[PDB]
Design a protein around this ligand. Structure first.
Ligand SMILES: [Zn+2]
Ligand SMILES: [Zn+2]
Length: 183
């Protein structure tokens, strides 16, 4: 079964972990995506609060992490490898540029880029490079997988989380979960 991640606490960090399955724009709303993050996190023994890395109605992706934890707290993957020095650095205009060589793991320990369970190496986000929501491009608040509606997404092969591609909601992409505060 999935092995648990037991974080040796030292200094505050926030984990960025991918869901175990890709999802389409029809996620049953943000409530739907957040619940899967919460469930999969607990399954590997994490105690923090995980929320989907997505913008929603009246909610900018940028304000997902608690104010106090935004400017300094390092972002690390499941294996506690650093992806970013802080939350704010992703919204610096770098388009969420990750550390060269970095890798994103699912809650169950798989490298999303290397594993075939994720056919499409793209991440949904519904936001601009500032982390502001795109009301015209977030699959109607992640409630539809119809070909006609779009959701802003990013190619992971690029190394950046916030690239600006408007993709058809009828697509199976990677969805990330971010620990919203350190405790
Ligand atoms: Zn096992
Ligand atoms: Zn850890």
């Amino acid at each position: 079964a999935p092995l648990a991640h037991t974080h040796q606490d030292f200094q505050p960090v926030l984990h960025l972990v991918a869901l175990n399955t890709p999802l389409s724009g029809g996620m049953r709303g943000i409530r739907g995506a957040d619940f899967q993050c919460f469930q999969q996190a607990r399954a590997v023994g994490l105690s923090g609060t995980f929320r989907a890395f997505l913008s929603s109605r009246l909610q900018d992706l940028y304000s997902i992490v608690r104010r106090a934890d935004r400017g300094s707290v390092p972002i690390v993957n499941l294996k506690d490898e650093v992806l970013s020095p802080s939350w704010d650095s992703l919204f610096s205009g770098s388009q969420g540029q990750l550390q060269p060589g970095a890798r994103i793991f699912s809650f169950d320990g798989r490298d999303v880029l290397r594993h075939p369970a994720w056919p499409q190496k793209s991440v949904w986000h519904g936001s601009d490079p500032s982390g502001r929501r795109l009301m015209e491009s977030y699959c109607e608040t992640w409630r539809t997988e119809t070909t006609g509606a779009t959701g802003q997404a990013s190619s992971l092969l690029s190394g950046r989380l916030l690239e600006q591609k408007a993709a058809s909601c009828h697509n199976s992409y990677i969805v990330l979960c971010i620990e919203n505060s350190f405790m």
